[PDB]
Structures are given as structure tokens and as C-alpha cells.
């Protein structure tokens, strides 16, 4: 999967922003959210989120679903589906990339 | 586009 955010911004640009966000938002987790390319679901135009580190994956599903519009929704992070009760702070620690961002893909199929 | 604070403090 290629991420529009990464096609638009090279590593220098992403890491510079990740450095700044981590300094100014210690309490929050930066997340880039994009649709798996072959999913029939609606594509998300607003893809950059700063979420409380104590928010859980399941709370994030609820908020993202609210922006995506009978269909199943699954998150993939580094090719695994996270547990809904995991906090976004823990998910970030385990899954963030070296630009200091967390990338979550979503699809209608497991 | 602009980063989006999601959910209140």
C-alpha cells in the first residue's frame, strides 16, 4: 500500500513535523489514516489526527466511523489488526514509524 | 491539510 501522505511529503518533511508535534503535543498521538486502496469504503479526505494517548482503538473506530459512513470496518497497523481495548498511546509506541507518525489503514475486509 | 485535534482534552 502506498500512502498519499508519504507520496506528498518526503521523510525530511514528515519527520520535521513529527518532531514538532511530539514537542508541542506530549499528550496526543499523531495518526495518519488512509483507506486500503482496493476497499469499497468511502475514502477519507481528512487523514491527519491528533488523538489523546488514553483514547482506545475502539473509541477511534467510533470517531472514524462517524466520518466514513451495514458494512464492517477494520484497522490495520503494520499488517495486524489491533485490539479494540488497546490505547492509542500503546499502539503508537509499538507501531510508529521513524518519522514519529502512526499509520493506520482501514478496510471492509479482515 | 491541517492536523485535526480529535476528541476533547
Amino acid at each position: 500500500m502506498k500512502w498519499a501522505y508519504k507520496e506528498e511529503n518526503n521523510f525530511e518533511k514528515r519527520r520535521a513535523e513529527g518532531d514538532k508535534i511530539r514537542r508541542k503535543y506530549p499528550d496526543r498521538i499523531p495518526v495518519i489514516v488512509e483507506k486500503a486502496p482496493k476497499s469499497k469504503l468511502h475514502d477519507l479526505d481528512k487523514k491527519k489526527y491528533l488523538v489523546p494517548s488514553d483514547l482506545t482503538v475502539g473509541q477511534f473506530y467510533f470517531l472514524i466511523r462517524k466520518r466514513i459512513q451495514e458494512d464492517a470496518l477494520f484497522f490495520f497497523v503494520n499488517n495486524v489488526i489491533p485490539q479494540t481495548m488497546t490505547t492509542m498511546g500503546q499502539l503508537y509506541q509499538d507501531h510508529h514509524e521513524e518519522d514519529l507518525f502512526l499509520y493506520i489503514a482501514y478496510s471492509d475486509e479482515s | 491539510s491541517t492536523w485535526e485535534i480529535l476528541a476533547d482534552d
Side-chain angles (χ1 to χ4, degrees), chain A residues 41 44 63-69 71 73:
Chain A
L41 298 177
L44 192 63
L63 293 165
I64 293 288
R65 279 193 47 97
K66 163 148 57 179
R67 180 161 287 180
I68 270 171
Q69 323 228 357
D71 287 323
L73 179 64

Side-chain angles (χ1 to χ4, degrees), chain B:
Chain B
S1 66
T2 301
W3 282 89
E4 180 168 10
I5 288 285
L6 180 67
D8 293 342
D9 287 330

Side-chain angles (χ1 to χ4, degrees), chain A residues 5 12 24-25 34-35 41 52 55 59 62 84 92 96:
Chain A
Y5 185 64
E12 190 283 324
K24 304 185 162 347
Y25 291 88
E34 299 197 29
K35 180 178 71 67
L41 298 177
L55 197 83
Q59 290 174 306
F62 175 83
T84 59
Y92 179 88
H96 73 87

Side-chain angles (χ1 to χ4, degrees), chain A residues 21-22 24-29 51-54, chain B residues 5 9:
Chain A
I21 284 177
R22 292 302 288 168
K24 304 185 162 347
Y25 291 88
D27 56 313
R28 301 225 163 216
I29 297 300
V51 308
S53 60
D54 43 293
Chain B
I5 288 285
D9 287 330

Side-chain angles (χ1 to χ4, degrees), chain A residues 11-12 18 30 34 37-38 40 48 50 53 57 80 87 102 104:
Chain A
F11 180 92
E12 190 283 324
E34 299 197 29
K38 272 139 197 236
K40 65 165 173 169
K48 311 197 308 187
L50 280 169
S53 60
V57 169
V80 296
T87 63
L102 174 66
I104 299 186

